[PDB]
Symmetry: C2
Subunit: 362 residues, 2 copies
């Protein structure tokens, strides 16, 4: 069959960051890992999807693909995306239900949509729902260990780089420092700029409430991952006692977790990550759910892929993440008039510059 999967090829890349990036629970990053998956159909068509980590899991994700998943996909018909997706979910279920398994599925799934897009002459933002092809964008700096001086300069760079919204890390040991930095940033950017905060589940319910009430005076748009993402009730406890809307989702790997969030976590914003909730298939499944609850669909990481998905739903924000994955693709993020812009090129709209990253392959 022309669209039968002839071969799958996965590569692992270790790409240095130009600077160390730091948050309260993931710690310090010196590089990130890039797992690419190329799928070849019998007629010769080629799709490439991918996933990333902040440095851990690369080999593990790749081992998964190469020994547990890719041998099962050869001979399957790549046009049956939902089916192949469902095949994987049960195929690796004993070692699945999120974790490494979802990253692996995501790389494969995104590959299939790259094939489908090319097969149908369609851009991802069209196949993903087409409501729009631009979206709101904010800068997410992974900047917890930065001196306040560095922090303000950095944010000044964002604003002058043509963005109009910023998110900073919180989660310092001395909560007073977080309050001080927040107030510092608000003073810098003025009243007309969307400001978010991200705690990276570093706080207790008590602490988050204590912190939230402390800074709500600086007009915070949302308060991301205040406590452990598994503590859905904790979120509801936090929300019931604070005014800043809560956000979460980057760490949810499963449509069921998204169900819990919507049903119990009292979120204002939700943040499915295609790289680790089952590619574009799983992402759409999550974004549908979130929309059925009338909650804006946003995304962290992977700006080059997620611009198509956020724009397609046209309700949420796109995080312009500090891992510069798009700088190693043939289309770094496009920003016109404060909005990120999806490609009209058929496929997922991401083509890696293999020559540039060849040097970082493992």
């Amino acid at each position: 069959m022309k669209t039968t999967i002839k071969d799958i090829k996965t590569r692992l890349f270790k790409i240095p960051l130009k600077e160390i990036l730091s948050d309260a629970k993931h710690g310090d990053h010196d590089h990130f890992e890039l797992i690419t998956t190329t799928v070849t159909l019998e007629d010769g068509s080629q799709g490439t999807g991918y996933t990333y980590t902040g440095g851990k899991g690369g080999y593990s994700i790749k081992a998964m693909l190469e020994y547990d998943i890719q041998p099962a996909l050869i001979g399957k018909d790549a046009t049956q995306i939902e089916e192949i997706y469902d095949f994987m979910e049960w195929h690796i279920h004993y070692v699945g239900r999120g974790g490494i398994s979802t990253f692996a599925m995501s790389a494969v799934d995104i590959a299939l949509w790259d094939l489908k897009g090319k097969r149908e002459g369609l851009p991802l933002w069209k196949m993903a729902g087409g409501k729009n092809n631009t979206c709101k964008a904010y800068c997410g700096g992974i900047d917890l260990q930065f001196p306040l001086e560095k922090l303000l300069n950095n944010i000044c760079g964002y604003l002058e780089s043509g963005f109009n919204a910023v998110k900073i890390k919180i989660g310092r040991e001395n909560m007073q420092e977080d309050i001080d930095r927040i107030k510092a940033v608000r003073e810098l950017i003025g009243p007309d700029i969307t400001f978010m905060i991200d705690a990276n589940y570093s706080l207790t319910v008590e602490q988050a409430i204590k912190l939230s009430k402390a800074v709500e005076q600086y007009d915070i748009t949302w308060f991301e991952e205040p406590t452990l993402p598994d503590d859905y009730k904790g979120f509801a406890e936090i929300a019931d006692n604070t005014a800043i809307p809560l956000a979460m989702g980057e760490n949810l790997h499963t449509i069921h977790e998204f169900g819990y969030a919507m049903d119990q976590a009292k979120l204002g914003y939700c943040q499915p990550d295609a790289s680790n909730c089952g590619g574009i298939t799983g992402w759409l499944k999550a974004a549908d759910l979130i929309t059925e609850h009338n909650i804006p669909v946003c995304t962290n990481g992977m700006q080059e892929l997620h611009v198509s998905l956020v724009s397609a739903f046209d309700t949420g924000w796109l995080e312009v993440h500090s891992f510069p994955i798009d700088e190693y693709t043939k289309r770094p993020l496009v920003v016109e008039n404060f909005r990120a812009v999806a490609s009209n090129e058929p496929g997922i709209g991401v083509e890696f510059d293999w020559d540039k990253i060849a040097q970082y392959e493992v």
Copy 2:
């Protein structure tokens, strides 16, 4: 420091089953995978823990250990088990929250308890709580594709092997066959034998209810994993409409999932698996919780390790699983008078016969 971790060594084994084993969602098994982890302290002490899969994840789990976890543990003090455990949970959190990551942690954690047991001259059933050193045992046959004739013989083997309780797989396409096999087995074993059924999350809520009411007349002790383990409400829906107590837990990888189960799933029995909920540390954390809810603590798989843990809590059942891991250890499961018996040897009570399994290493 004497108990500083000098080296960690992980091996992967592919061990053929003497026969194909089959259930409704994991499909057919021809082998299982065994991941051993040996930890060497500076004073020379050695502990070995492990994990298993039904064939998928081996390389992935091992990649995890070797590239993401073991390099972080060298130089740490092996006597700080809870600490090292907490270190891992956040270390691999972006790629964690269950999945491959928990298997990997489990192999490491169990290694540390093997060191601790040997360090303190204590058997695992003592360190794990000591309430008893024998426990109730039932045979879990992975037998879905067996002709009824085979099935009854097989079960007859169990009963004559000195067991007094049996669990069979259900989840055939024709639900009538499952009802027929269940009735068949009950007739065979008579009224004095504990009978469980395991559906391996192959059913819908409707189907499970339909099936449960159908067979409750044959005195079923529990009804394991009727539907997707993520659907905690589905469980409560099933339980609210049926009489056979529900069981679950083998597929829960996280203390939070166990919280959900207890708070929403309305279980009669709960089944933490040390091999994939964070070793003995994580297991104890789950068994405590389950006990605080006054629900019997049981275990699937890994009879040679779990006999110490079930006996220590003295409320639950031990599944004598069909992967014969213990046949490759220097102490195959001991059964006296229908009860499984834990070792009084210090450590976890499992020593692999390396010569025997050398031939299956990858």
